[model samples]
Each structure stands twice: as C-alpha cells, then as structure tokens.
Target chain A: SMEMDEKDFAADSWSLAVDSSFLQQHKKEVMKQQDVIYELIQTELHHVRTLKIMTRLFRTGMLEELHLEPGVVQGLFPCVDELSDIHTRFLSQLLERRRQALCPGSTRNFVIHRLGDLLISQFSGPSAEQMCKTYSEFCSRHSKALKLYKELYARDKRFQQFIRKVTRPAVLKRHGVQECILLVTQRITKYPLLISRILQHSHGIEEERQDLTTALGLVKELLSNVDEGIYQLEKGARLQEIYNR
Target chain B: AIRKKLVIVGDGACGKTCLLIVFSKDQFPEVYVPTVFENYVADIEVDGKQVELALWDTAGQEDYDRLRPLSYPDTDVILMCFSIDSPDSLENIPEKWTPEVKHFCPNVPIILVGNKKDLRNDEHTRRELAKMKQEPVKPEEGRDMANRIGAFGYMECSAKTKDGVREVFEMATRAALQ
Candidate 1:
C-alpha cells in the first residue's frame, strides 16, 4: 500500500479510499468493517499476483526458455492454468462489487456496506466447488512437485541454469515456485479466518452478521472438506509406500 | 453426411444476414430466427447429398474490426459480398475486404456476391446513386472483380425476393467440396 504508483489514484476501491479524508468521516465500527473488507480484497489481489508469477515466470520459462518437454513442464505446475482462471474470476467479482459501490459523482472512491452476501456466494457455489477441486489437486501434488524440481535441478543442466536465470529478476527474487505453491495452498485456508474476523467486527448489523455467519460456516466446511481430501491423498500415498516395500 | 464451414464478410447493411436467413428459411420455416444472428448450422442438401454448413457472420462495422478474425479459423469457404447499390462496397473488395479475407483465409475458395439485386433496378436506388454520380454495380463489373480477385465464381442475389439465393449456396457448396 505504501508504494503507491501514479495509476493507483483510482485503480481499486482500497487504493482510492486508504488515504481519503472521506474515509475518516465514517464512525469507528464502519471503519473497522471497511478495514477487514480491505484486507479481503488485498489478499485476493495478492494471491492472483502470486499465481501469475508462477505461471508466467516459472511455467513459461521452463517450457519455452528452457525448452523442457511439455510433460515435464506440466509435472511441476499441475492445473496452474485452471487455478489462475478460478482466482481471476473470483477477483473480478470482488472488483465488480467494489465498482457497484462507487461514491456519488466520484470515480476515486467507493464504500461497500455489505460484503457478506458476496462472500457467501463465493464460498458456496459452483465456483467454490471448482476452487476445492483444483486446490486439492494442486496441494496434494505439492510434495511431489517440489521433489520433481529438485531432481530436475540436480540432473539437468538446462533446468539448473533456467531456474537460476529466472529467479534473478527483481519480482522473482522473493517468489519462487515453492513459495508460490505454498501461498496458493494456504490461500483457501485464510478465507475462514478473514471472514470470522469480519463477522467479529460486524456487531449489531443483524442481516450482514447472519450472512457472515453462513459464509464463515461455508468456508470452514470447504476448508475441512479440502483437508479431508488431502488426508485421503496422503493415505493413498502411504498405501503405495507399503505395497512398494 | 459431410460438414463444411462458410463465413460471410462485407460492409455494414450489405444484406449478409438476409442472405443467410433466406437460405435458412427453406429448412427451418417453422422457427423464426430474428434479424440478429450468431452462427447458424444449416442442414442442406447439395447434389442430392446431405451437407451441414456452418454459416458464420462477421460484423462489418470498423469498431468490431479486431474481433472479426475470431470467426476465420477453419473456414472452408468465403462468401465475400457487397451491396449492388453501393459502389464503395464493391471497390472495397479489392482495397479492404479482399486483402483481409486473403490474409486470414488464404487458399480458401471465395464466391463474390452482389447482394440486394432487387435494388439494382429500382428508380429510388438509381436516383440516390445518381446524386453521388455513381450507378449500381453491374453484373459484368462484379464478374471482372471476381476474376481480378481470383474468386472461384461470381453471382447476384436479392435476399428480399429470395432470387438466386439457392444457387449461391449451391455454388458455394460445390466449391467447398472441390
């Protein structure tokens, strides 16, 4: 938020309102709810950004720049495309909600009063199902994906050099495939925490509070379901281990 | 059954939609497709054999110029058209339309058509073009332009009257098969 570019003047609801005197006029609780909402958007936008870095920086470089085989490339980044698309779709809906809440005659600011309805839809619908399925695959493969990368780096000079060159870029210095995969795997788990916090601050607003309660329940349910799927995946791997032994 | 795809392109208000609807009428008369169009998959009979033709229409307005190329992939034939009363549309065949069609749909057979044939003889149409010191595009001119652009053939039709509509597809279908 500190490194505000010139274009950030009206880029999004959060960027527009973070420094506004308009935002200061709202009472304590309203400002509190607004802060959580801002965190929700910020986290989402950051998740999308991380996914993009994985796809463009790691995936593209390995495939074209390193001239790695498509099969090998896919092994390191399974369903990255679908994951990117799903998060992008969700982020767009969030932005659309912000746009719908624009302050009168002002392109530079917006105030979203109720986001619980949006959160519920996001965590309960077909979109949530897709998120669960895609993340399950991606998370389950995380250990194997990292193992594959390390093995490739050890045996293959081209991959070793490619990864070295790719990570030197300023954007990629702090973010690599391992860091990105962890970010993605943890992204879904953060929603429940974020929503519960928003619910805590919701206070006397019964309608938004009830909707937040539903959303919080739905996201927690989604999280456990995903974890159970991952547990089953680990169980399968352990069974394979015993059979191989 | 054999399936082929055809895309029609020309200036706006040039009767490309009418040509498609008129051709579709003989098959789906009970179903009224409104003036607006997306793609139409018409089950046609040509040379006593069944053929499914995918009729793709492109927006001729300059605003959609970038989005139009999405329709060109896997196109089997082209029905490059212009209005009979608009000489500018006819001239565009060589200047604007032909180049674009050739760029995207190279080696695909193109059938040049002068649509709105009914207007070519109307007194009102004549007076309108006469004010611009231009007459309606004649059959010979279309034929010569077809030769110049290396089109497979040239034909005229009026979608309003359904005149020469069937023959246009018949020619297009035959060329597509070849």
Candidate 2:
C-alpha cells in the first residue's frame, strides 16, 4: 500500500504526487491514450474550422447577392454559442478523464453516447416543439432557393467552368466544399426521420420533448442559411466571365 | 448496370447547396449557411424515360478539398454554381476550381449556373464592376472547359425568386438523356 501524506489528500496535490516512475513504466500505454485524445481534438478542431468557413462564406455571399433580410444572417451565430459551450464542457471532461485510469473501455463510443444522452435530456418538452417548428419553416424556404439554383447552373457554360476550376483538387485540396455542402443538405432532409428516431429511442422525461424539438429546429435553420449562401456563388454572372477564358 | 451519380461544385458562398435543396425539396430558404456535406437521391421521368439524380453538395473551404473525389466517385453529372453579385466568387470558379471537379468526375455532364438574377435590375451596374473584377474571359472559356472534360453547357438563374432554378435541372436531365 502506498503511503498517503496529508498534503497528498488535496485534489491538486494528489495529481502532482502521482509516481512519475509509474507513468514512465506505462509510457507506451499513456502515449496511446494521448494519441486517442489528440485525434479527438483534431476531429473537433476540424469541425470548428468547417463551421467557421461555412459561416463566413454564407454571410459574405448573402450580403452581396441574395438581398436576404438583414437579420437573416444573425441566425447562424446562435449555433456557434451553443456548440462552443457543449464542445468545451465535453472536451474538458474527456481530457480530465484521460489523466486518470478511471475511464472505462471504448472511450470514444462512451463519450459519444454520453453526449447523445445529454442532448436528449436538453431537448425535452416545449423546447423540442419550438425547434421542430423553426426547422420546418427553414426547410420550406431552403427548398425553394435550391430549386432556383438548379435551373441556373444547367444552362450557363461560363458559370459551369468557373465552379469546376475553383472546386478543383489542385486549389482547395482539403475539404471538397462542394461535396460537404451536398452531404449537409442531405442530412437536413433526414432530420425529420432523425427526430422521430430520437423520440422513440430516448427514454427520458416526457417534458423534455420541447427542448429536443427546438434544438433540431435550430440546426435546420442554420443549415438552410448555409445552403442559400452556396446558391449565391453558383449563379453569379461575374463568376461566369472569369471562368469563360 | 449502375446509373451515374451527380456532383455539384462551386466557390464559397455560391448557390450550390441551394440548388441541391431546391431539387431535393422544391423550395428555398430565406437564408442558409454554406454546406459541409449533403446528398440526395431522386428519380425523375423525362420524356417517358426514368433518370436517376444522385446529388452531392460539398463545402467550398480550401481545407475540405481532399474530400471532393470521395463525393464524386462514379458521378455522371457535374453542376457548378456561381453567384453573379460577387465577382470574386465567380472569378474563382473557372481559374481555380473547375479542374478539381474534372479530375474526379471526368466525362460527366457538366452544367454552369449564374445565380441571383432577381437582384439584377436594381444592382445591374454594381454587377458590372464584379464582372470586371473577374478579368473577363472570352465565351470560348466555357466551350473549352466542356470540351476538355466532355461536359455540356452553361446556364443562369436566381434561387431566391425561383427564376431559372427548375430549368437548370431539366437541362442537365436532358443532357443525361442524350
């Protein structure tokens, strides 16, 4: 048995007094855990980067071309606040556990399930209903804009060439902006189904339905805004001339 | 035999997502953010022939470029969208982005769209400056691009007011039919 001094009783002191030799002996295992944590952080960072780029593109595009209502762009920011808080809290807890041997097996899956449970808890009752309503409305409008963009791209040659070049591999070689956008929109289409599944599977308090509905609605609204921004770029005439040569 | 899928490409803030949304849901949103990843599968009947529309929408950020080919695998139609209001967005389309689409979805039916025509009359003059910023190329640019990749033609529309959006899809479908 290890001796426990009075100083080692404190939480901070306990961490400090942990045998360095123990850590060193298990260095490979510790490094493996660290690698997993690093990969998780990298994944999250990528997600944040994607969100930021999408937001900037949507804001600039909407401001210039669509003449969308001024406050329309504001809808995208709220998600940023929500996502930041959730991501920070979740990551903090995750990293904290990484320092201790208390973490159970399959940490990645465990984390995801835990987060999903939290989401389920937050979306119960009136909040969920509100989200559903808002999401439905946003989807309605987004669908219209999508129709218009499809027609424009079909007939214009200059515009066609321009999109092809900018989205080419040699230029933007990391995220295929075009492909990601499409996948996101498809995900939006699947929201209703996702919600239903959540409602069926989540055995949480019934009152929390509203929260879940609202959360989904907010996600839909933000996603729709992103779709509209992409539409603006696709149909721009100036873009046509540039690609024409 | 497997039918070909469709890949949509564009610059940041272009209407690529909106176009896909319209085709998938037949509606428009008041506002939208750029897409990260979205796809839709639809079956259309054109001239009594059934055609499959497999659409993939992607993010326009430079960092996400590596994922484009994954989306374009086995693609048969490529739709590239650009906005008329923002010249920078439009200019980046041809010179920097098209080659990437070609590399992944080669020999596919390619269509071009100039979105946001509803704001045309009111902001017509400002648009000209945008055009100038794009460093105006000759008409042959579109033909050259198409010829190089065995693609089709260029079209234009406004996703906001529902102008020309439907037609673009129809044309692509028609091209696919041929």
Candidate 3:
C-alpha cells in the first residue's frame, strides 16, 4: 500500500476515462475485466518494490557497511537479482501494452479490447519458463534462508543495528527481510486465481475466453511446480535437522 | 627452508586487508571489500634463513566470531592490527582481540601493528575525529596496547605509501621463527 501511495497506478488509464454510450452496453463485464487488469499490474509493481527493498536496501547495506560476509548475504537473498529482472521485464511489457491501447488524443485513457493476448504472452512460452525456473530456485531455498536470517539476527549485533536503521524508513513498513521473502515466494501462487477472475469476465468473446483459459492453465502449472519444489525442500531440511541432531 | 603462518585480525575497515595485499603482492587495493577469509604467501629471508610466511586474513565482524578461530590452528604468529585513525579500533585490541587470540593460539607470538600510518598526520582525519571530541590514535597508545597484551613487538606501517610495510612482516617472520 505504501508503494501504491508513492505513485499513481500505471494501469488505470481506462478507469480514469469518462464512460461513453458505447461502453454502457457491456459495462458490467467490461468494468470487471478492467478492474482485474488494474489489480494485476498494481500487484506486479508492489512485488518489484518489495524485491528492491530486499536487494538495494538490505543486501547492499549488509555487505558494504554491516560487514556481513558475501556467503551469508547470498544465503539470505538467493537469486533475488534474477527475480527482480524477470518482474521488471514483465511490468514493462504490461505498461507497453497499455500504451499501445491508448485512446486517440488522450494521454491518460485507453481502450484495450483484448487483454487476454497480453496475458497469454506473459504466462506461456519463454516468459513462463523463466518465471517457473526463478521462482522454483527461490522457493526451494526459502526455508534455509529464513533460518540463517533468524540465527544471525539473534546473535550478530552489527546485523541487528543495520536492520534497525534500515527498517526505520516509512517505505519499508512491516516489510522486513523475512516478510519480503515470504511475499515474493507467495507471488507466483497468486497468478492463477487472478487470471481466472479475468477469464470469468471473458464470456462474450470466444477467442478471448480461450486465451484466458490457456493463460490460467499455464500459471497453474507454474504454481504446481513451485509448490512441489518447496515441499521437497522443506522435507529435506527437516530430515537434515534430525540428522544433525 | 622454513614455513610459518601469520594471521591478521582487526576491526572491519581498519586496513587489515590492504596491509596483507600490499605486503604479499606489492600492490594496494584502494577499495574496501569486507573480507571473509583470504590467504596469501610471502617468501622472506629472515636472519639468513629462507622463510615462507603464510598470511591469513580473518573477518573481524561480530558475525564471523565463531568462524574466525578456524584460521588460528597452525598460526605460528599473530599480526594483531588496528587503524591509526580510529581510536576505538585500538581500544578493541586489548578488550576484544587479545582474549580471542590467547584462547585459540595460546603462547603464539603477537606483533601489534598500527596500519594506515599515513592517516595519522592527515588533516582530514584529524577534523573528522575532532567532530566527536576524539583524536587519531598516536604511536604511544599503540605501543601501550602492545605491552598490555604481551606482544613480541610493536610496529606501524602505511599500505598507501608502502612506508614501513615490509618491516611489519619482517617482524612477524622473526617472531614466527622464534
């Protein structure tokens, strides 16, 4: 919410425009679909902001000033750079789509007839594969990373001081390192249901309906893969903990 | 041929890494990289004997407190260092560093080193410390710490100017061979 308040919504062009007589006929479904699209883009922006807090704020300060070793910092934020890159590219593509659909002579209003095509592009093919791979790596290592962070926070005074100072800012409210990691790992699981909502509003157009269905399936598959990986990782960690004892 | 190990320990950003890098490679690193574990070897002739001194660099952050002792097992001598610009760094010598060194490598000869000797006379360093009602650590304060810890010798050097840098390790080699 802090990220949302920091800037205007990037995907609110259509919502900002005055509704015309042509828009009145299909107002119910059209409004619902546009709402979902706006929600999707807004959440993506927030996710990217969270990743920035993890990397630019916490990771950088820990290594440069707090004197944490590179290995310890890596364990705390595994593959975060890769995750940031993927989401940034995806957000750019969404914003570009909104730009292309801008209404004539209007900088702040757009009419996008087929949002499903953009969703299909993002949730399928190479884009989908990249997300699946990066999310898998991050989710699998989540437990170990959280454990290491708690251990360090309990004993290391320098790390405690750094975290206290860094988190004092308003932008990082309730978004500590652990919360940020959990939010990121949960982001992949959210796409399927959101795309399903968008699909629900695609009843009138057969082609758009099929596209949304396909995108929904693709994201569901990605979530399943990540869930399985996380399951195996947690299991292995628990077994290892017993073995260590 | 004789082989010896010397480990350098000091507060973070107190010029420990640059001292070892300059001594071993004949070059200085201008950037400050928080070191974890770095090792280098310098071959020196001390009193007519060829000595291969293995230099071990340890991270001084509290996060690495448990991991630092792993470098002390075979250390024949310790180069316990503090920056000449930071009075708190020198204060930590007797309070934090000496007890750890004594516990891990008991009776190992220690050469108390004052690094960044060039900063001792820098006007900018003086002004910065003046802000906090403090002054740059002087030679006598370092020598007092050396005596309090029962160090084998006391030395000061500047990695920036390569002034007295070689002598610091020469002292380490001499004490290591003792």
Candidate 4:
C-alpha cells in the first residue's frame, strides 16, 4: 500500500494544547481514512478524467486534426467539455492534498486547507464567480443537448456512429449525453456528502472546524443553485416540445 | 438574492457572444465560435442587493431565428445589440430585431447597445465601412433607435477594450430588477 509524496503530518504540532492521547488513538484511524478518502478521490478522478478525454482529447482532435465543424463535436456534449479542464484541475489538486496528507506522522488538518481556500475563491467576491456561471449556463443546456442527441441519432449517420463510438463499453457508459450532463450537475452536490462524513468525526481544531463549516456552506449554496437551474432546463425543454408539436 | 434573465439578439458577426463571454468570464476570446444557445449567470451586487443575473446568448443568423426565440421566454429584459462599426447591423435594429422581439415578448423591455465602440473611431474600420458607401453607426443613430423602439436605454461598449462593458450589464441588471 504505497501512500504519498510524504508531506509532514506531525500530531504534536497541533496548536492550543490539543490532546496527544486522542491523536495517538486516532493515528491509525487517520491512516485508515486515507484509504477511504483515496477511494473518493480515485472515483472522482476516474469520472472527471474520463470526461476530459472525451471533451478535450476528442473535441480538439476532431476539430483541428480532422477539420470537422466545432458544432458537430460540441453539440454532442455541449458545455460538458468546457467544464472538464476546470474540474480536472480541481480534482487533481484535491487528490494531491489527500495523498500528501497520508504520509507518515501526518494527520490531515482541515483548518490550514489549500482546498478550502480554493473553494472560497469563487464566493469571496461580487460577480467574480466563474464556475457558478459555468454551472448555470451548462445546466441551461442540459435538456437541449439531449434533444439534440435524439435528433442527431435519428437523422445523421455520422453523428450516430460517433455517439456509439463514444458510448462503447471501452468508454464511459450512460454518458450518451443526458447522463453526462446530469452527472456533472450532481458533481458539486456530491462534495457535501463526502465532506460531511469527514466533518462528522474530525475538525480537531476550532479553526479547522470553522473553515470546514464555511466550505460546506459554499458547496451547499452552489448545489442549491444548480439544482434549480436543472429544474429550469427540464421546464424549458418540455415547453419547447409542446410548442414544436 | 434576486434571479433574473437577459437575452441578447442581433445579426451574426455582431459580437453578441463576445459581449456575454467578456462580461461573464472577463477573458476575451481570441477565436470566434458562433453561439449555440450559450447562457451564463452572474452573481452580481448592485447597491447592497445581490442579483443572480442569468445572461443568455443567442445566435443572430437567419438560420437561428426559430431557435433563437426559444430563449426569450421568462426573459425579464432583452439586450438589443448592434455593432457600432457596422451600419447594416444597426440598420436591422429597427427593421428586424425590434419586430421579432416585440412580436414574441411585447411586454419585455429592451436595452439597445452599440457594441464595438472601440472601432467607431478606428481608422481601418471606418475605412472598411466607407468602401461600401456606408459609415459606422453613430451614437446618435443608436440613441435614435433606442427611442424609436421604446428600449429602456441605450449604451455603447467595446467588449475587446472592456470599456462600458460592465455598465451594459449593470444597467440590464437594474432594469431586470425593476
């Protein structure tokens, strides 16, 4: 069981007279949870990375190499590709920290969080947010992309073959188009679940506890927003279906 | 927090997506990819109020006329845009866009914008428009169209230079709130 780049994780370095016994008793558990956290990181990495290959690898190659219209490839997944780079970087950073904290003599501290600070970057300013807008705009296209896929699957042989190639067992399943959008929409919402479990028992220091709470709040706010945007996407798509008929 | 929707409509090559991308991301796009129902939300603060402004970008080519109007519903305001460097784009403001917007969303208010203001005085742009026996659309022309179509206000901005770009959104957000 290889662990990490081996960043320092001393238990006694905890400030404010923290209990060494609690630390000693939990030291094994700290190492144990590394497996758990790694599982989460690995799974998220799996999804985000696979998405990058489809969006980044195929999107650019198809357009530049084969000289296909950007629209044909883009309309296949819509905003899914744009968000891949952002989240791919985000997930990599998250996994790096998780791996770094797993090194010997280390107990993961939430207070001095590079990840927490990174999470707050979008919410700390006015109209300075990008991911939320990306999420919102992306959600707006969710159903529209699905409908486009349906139209393409029936009308265009080349697009259908492309869709089939992308959805083969060798590739990510259910990512036909609709599933990809839904999964990405649900991606941010997923952090709270993982973070809550971590937050439930940890937060050794009050400062770490406070930062965790703020991170949870921002993640929750982001979830609530996209959830509504998803509802609107469904509504708009249905509205068009009726109007078209 | 208040949530609102804004839709921008005009002719192709008129820089509609650039305006939305510039305002939402603050990064100018070097290469153009024509819009296909692009939408963005800005978490804005205006005078102590928080606004989740949903910015909708629409295609302006004739091909998208049917597809473009699909974004118009529930729109609190419409941003009617034309390029200051292209007289034909501005000419279509009253001749085409106003009618299309009015026909579908008669009750919604519009903010007429003259985009590409940096080019209004640019020697090359003016030279190009002059070769076609046309001149750049002047500020007065934009103002006149705004009044002519009953738009809420008229604004000019260069998405490239970012001058008055924020104001276009700031004003649209205020109108959406009203």
Candidate 5:
C-alpha cells in the first residue's frame, strides 16, 4: 500500500526522508503521467470538435459554397457524434479517476491502471469494438476524400475559400482530411505507449505494478485485433489504388 | 450478315464508350474511358439473323473536332447522346451535336439518346441539380427533343449496368434499314 502519507512532501518534510534519485525522478514522473492523461483526453475532445465541424461544413458549406453534388458529398461515413459520444464518456471517466487519484497525491503508475476497462468495456462493451470496425472503414476513405477536396479547392473558387476558412484553426487544420483520418487511425495505438511508459515506473508496489502489467497486456491484445482489421482495409484499398493507377 | 454502321456521338464522359463496350465487348471499362474510345465491328444477333454493327465512337472534344467528321461520311445511323446529369449536355443536343451530325449525315437516321440515365434518380444528382435550380432530363423532355430534332427514336440507358443498351442497338439497327 503506497499511500501519500508514506512520503509526506506536503511541507517539504520528505526533502531529506527520500533518496536523491527518488527525489529527482518522482515528482517529474507523476507530473509526466498526468500530462499524458491530459493529452489523451484533450486530443480526443479536439477530434470530436473537428469532426463535428467537418460534418457541418460538408452538409452546408460544401453544397452551397462549392457547388458539389449533394449526393456525392453525402458519402458513406462513420458517425462522428457517436464516436464523440464514446470518447467524451471515456474522457470524463478518465478525468474523474485522475481527480480522485492525483488530487490526494495518488501514486505515479495508476495512470495506466484500469485503462483496459476504459478502452474495451468502458461503454459496456460496445464503443471500442465499434471504433475498430468503423476505423477499418474510415481509414481507407481518406484517399477518396483527399482527392475530392483537392479538386474542389482548385475547380471552385468558393470551395477554396470555404475550406481555407475552416482549415485555418488547429481545431480544423489537420490538412483537409488525410491528417484527421491519420490521427483517428493512429489514436487507438497511442494508449499502448502511455501504458508502457507508466508501467516502466510502476514498480516497488507489487499490486499496483501487477495491475498495470495486466492492463497493458489487455490493451496490447485489444489493439492487435484492431491492427489486423486496419491492415485488412489498407490491403484492399492499396491493391485497388495500384490497379487504378 | 447485313452490315449496319452505327455512330455514337456525345459530350465527353457522356457514356459513349461504355454504351458501345457494354454491348459489344461484354465488359465495363471503369477507368478513364478514352475520349475517342475504340472501335469494334461485332456480329450481333438481331431478329433471328446475324448482322454486323460497326460501333464508331467519336471524340467529343473540340481538339478532335476536325477529325470527327471524317467518320461521318459512311455512317448509316447516328446515336446522338447527352448526359442526363449534365444540363449543358442535354442543352447541347440541338445546339452542338445535332448541327454537327446534320452537316455530314443529314439523311442519316438520328436517334436522340440520353446517356447515364441512371443518374436521374441519384440523390446526389438530384441535389446537385437542385443547387443549380434545375432537374434531370425527363422522359418527356427526351421524347420532345427527339421530336423537335426529327430523330427516328428516343432512348435512354445506363452503360454501367448494361441496362437498355441492347434495346438501343435493336432500335438503331432497325432504323438503319429504312
């Protein structure tokens, strides 16, 4: 049981109590772990924001501004709000857990703890499965979207300005669609990195270390299944692109 | 086999190549269909007899305008096509295609054909034209165009699905006999 009371640095009491090595690494490690959590949550929230704007812009600005075919613009796509729903819920749970753990100065490695639960069964066994399936489909659509966006930008002056206006901000400026899709494709794999990093500094407390090890294993397994699904879509699209060329 | 030469004319990407290839070659060319497309003189079964239909697809661009009329001299029937999705293509029927065909083959039976008829109901096409405050060419409009232009027949087809393609030739082959 590694509690905050064990190392009381509240009034700098632990300046001498802990070793110089622990003193140098411990505070930075804890803060770095917290930084990872904040990035995960904030990035997803940004993704949700961008996707909402993308759907809205395609619906109104693209049709009216660009003179694109409404039916052509209405592509078969992932439900951005539904994905937002999953990520938002996941982020909230993550924030709440962070508040509970770190506000009272919880240990460093708990950042990776219970993340497997948040990833897979967090939405009661639906969202990650849904995300994997949708991302498999969504990743391949980048080429087509990128192709159309380039043409729309060149052929239509109004479309060029409209897209320029929208893409000016980081919230929307993922370089039209390839970056956003790349971000979404790469988003799930990021969890493993965060988990692995936290797992490195997760020793000394046997149970806490074991929980992180278990969670990392689960996340790795989950993403492998997702990785294969993404690979399948990529192979199909790649062959088709080659044949077309 | 009775040889009947059928000439197909249209604006670019107006399904001219697909129409001929769909029926003559039995495959859809999904790539960038060549502008001047290719030629195939196929032995077709029509009315219990084998008849040869020479499918001559003309280039629809102004770049090929000087070369296109050379194929018109010996033509028997003309299939003048316009894309239903492109209002400009339809508007070009009497404006561009009719005059061009008339100068070379005035006595030839002109069958006004509406190509990519499938896009007529496409929701994207519907909304696309809606943005322009326009609608797709209707059957009535096609029939009216045919009547106004003194065409022998009015037909519609989708080269993508091979729909109404055979019937188009059946109508064209019969008209060439007259």
Candidate 6:
C-alpha cells in the first residue's frame, strides 16, 4: 500500500487536515472508528483513481468499440456501492475472526487471502454482474462529466475564474469530496476488464473468474446506457435549435 | 434593441485572465494565479449601438466542472481562447469542453482566439514548438473547436503586443450584430 507508507500517509493526512476543516473536525471520530474510517477513505481514494482511468478509456472509444448495453451501464454505480461495502464488511469480519484465532502480526497473511476470497465470492453471478454494470456507467459518466465541465469552463470566463479560485485549490488538496467521489465512481468501471485478465491467468480460481466475467458484462451494459442518454440529449438539443430557427 | 454580451472562455494558464486585463485596463499581469470565476463588464459604443461586453474567465480543470454550467446563462457572444505557446490548452478546447458550451448556449456567437502571439518570436517560438512536440495535440485544436461550435470567426492574438487583440473582439462583435 503506497498510501500506508508512513511518510506519505503523514503528508497526505497533514494536507487533508490543513485544507479540510471537515476532516480535521472528524479526526476524533475517525480515530474511534479507525478501521472503518480507513476502509472508507481507501475505498473513496481507489474509486477516484478508477474514475480517471475509466473516463480515459471511454474517451478513447473503448466502450463503443466493445458494444456494451445501456441497462448494464446504469447498474455500475449501485454495484460499486455494494461491492465496496462488501469489501469493508469482509475485512472487518476477517479481522475479528483472526483476532480470535491468531496473534495480530501472525495472522496478517491469512487475513489477506481471506479478504481476497471474500472479494472473489462477492464477484460471483448476480453480484458480479451488478458490479460490472456499476463500473461501466461510472466510467462513461466520468468521461461525459469531464467533457461537459471543460467546455463550460472554457467558454465562460466567470465560471473559469470561480473554478480557478475554488475548485483548483480543492482538487490540489483533495478536499472536494463530491468531485472526488464522482471521479472514483467513474474509475471503478475500468476494473472489470483488469479483473477479467487476472481471473483468466489463474486456473485454480475458476469461481473467482466466473464472478469477474459476470461483473464485466454488467460494466458493458452500464456504459451503453450512459452513451444512449448522452446521445439522446445531444440529438434533442440539435432538434430544438432547428425548431427555434 | 438588445445589447450584445461578449463572454470569454478558456483553459487555465492560457492567458484568458491576462487578455481580459490587457483588454479592459490596457495592461498585463506577469503572474496570474488563474480565475475561479470573474467577469468584467464593459460598455462600448459601436456604430451608434451601445454594446455591453461581459467577459468571463473560468477555471480549467476537472474538479471545476460542477460550476461551469452556471456561467453561460443569457450569454450572447462567446470567445473560446487558447494559448499558442501551450498546445495542450488549445487541444483541450475540443477534447474536453466544447460540447457543453454548444449544449447550453446554442445560439451565442463564438470566436476562437489563440493568445500569447507575442511568444511567436524566434526564441519563444522555439520553446513553443518544443512544447507542442511534447504535447499530444497542436495549437490549431482551439480553432477546430470553434468551427465545431459554429463560431463566428477565429484569430490569433497577443495581449502583450495588442496584436490582433482589438480586431479579435471587433470581428466577434460584427458577427454577433449580423
């Protein structure tokens, strides 16, 4: 975990503390629920990274090339929320189970595999399908949102200035929670394909592979829905202009 | 008669703020920290018509996307800006943001203006060329974005030298009037 490296974590923590009063105020709560808080933050951070990657993928026309469906795309967000929650709970359960059976440091490796198994189980069938759909939708949305925002900022000076003063610093400090969350949701969409590749290489992990395959299908569907919505909006706007003229 | 409002939009670090300062005050700031949201309101008498040019400058990054839509309500004229020296800033106009503008301000007159023309000198051109080579897109991306959005015209200008700066605005206004 690059994020867990003491020096890096300390710097990130310090920056978050200084820039966001919300984080600072909740520091005590976070400490009290340290495990949950850490998991939550980690989940969000991973999601943000995923969104950036997914958006880039969509922009490069990967989703269209793949011929994914729309309903699956719409399912991506909910799937992410579900799988993320599963990961959190699974880790917590494993920690509890390990605490009873083995000493802290002694059980670390066991806990890792246990958690991986949990993730694998969660990825099977319907759950995996949901996860995939959620991921794809998120990815497509991220790309669209990025595109929309870029143009708005470019053509409107007032908006541009506001973004400069407020959003720029927020992004630098990672204090813009909503924006970050949105970005993360998008990124999670890209994981299905990678997950698929990982599953294919592991012959012993047939169940895990099957789950991942379903998840991928869901992701494709999610992306398709988003693309359709965007298309319709664009078409409607064009028609409206013609009617007005 | 309805007065024309000219709005300016561009990525951060593309001299949009500098252009606004130069056009409004006839001066440029050496170091600009980018605008989050600011508009300059100016009244000019053009051919017996009093036109109000409302110049807007926006933030150029992804996190600022939520606030971008709020800047375009009732806008009449749009200036899409890019810096010739920074080709990425120009390329982003098309790949990143033009579609949203077309969606929101469909009927507005748009003009693509490539800024930092003073950097076209031999020494600066070398630096710009190097930057362009390093970047994925060329400086002409901004102009292409303007065409995609049905812009009234396109021009390259420098706020520092006032080269084509006034003419850029004049041409946009002329198109809007028609």
| Residue B61 local lDDT, model 3 | 29
* Clash list (residue pairs), candidate 5: A71-B124
Every model's TM-score: 0.52, 0.40, 0.52, 0.45, 0.42, 0.39
Q: Is the docking of candidate 5 incorrect, acceptable, medium or high quality?
A: incorrect
True contacts kept of 5: 0.00
For candidate 1, lDDT tens digit of each residue in A160-218? 88877877676453365655655566566557656776788797689989999999888
Worst 10 residues of 2 chain B by lDDT: B29-38
Better model by TM-score: candidate 1 vs candidate 5: 1
Q: How does chain B of model 2 score on TM-score?
A: 0.76
Please write out the lDDT profile of model 6 over residues B66-172, one tens digit for every residue.
33444455567788887877767776787556787788888777788888876655485666577545432344665566677677777888888777877776676
Query: Pick by DockQ: which candidate is best?
Result: 2
The 10-residue segment of model 6 chain B with minimum total lDDT is B29-38
* TM-scores, chain A, per candidate: 0.86, 0.35, 0.85, 0.67, 0.64, 0.38
Candidate 4 backbone collisions, by pair:
A9-A105, A9-A106
DockQ of each model against the real complex?
Answer: 0.01, 0.03, 0.01, 0.01, 0.01, 0.02
Q: Second chain TM-score per prediction?
A: 0.92, 0.76, 0.93, 0.91, 0.90, 0.79
True contacts kept of each: 0.00, 0.04, 0.00, 0.00, 0.00, 0.00
* Candidate 6 residue lDDT tens string, A18-48: 2243334434433222222223233334443
Candidate 1: regions farther than 4 A off:
A1-16, A231-245, B1-178
Which parts of model 3 have CA positions greater than 4 angstroms off? A1-6, A10-26, A231-245, B1-178
Q: How accurate is chain B of model 5, given as a TM-score from 0 to 1?
A: 0.90
CA lDDT, candidate 5, residue B86? 84
DockQ of candidate 6 relative to the true structure = 0.02
Instruction: Write the number of the candidate with greater TM-score, choosing between 1 and 2.
Output: 1
What is the model-wide C-alpha lDDT for candidate 2? 0.48
Per-residue lDDT of B1-178 in model 2, one digit per residue for the tens? Answer: 1234666777756777666766676666432211233345566666676775666665433333322343554567778776665556656766666778767656666787666655445455465766566433333554454455445787777676777877877677777665
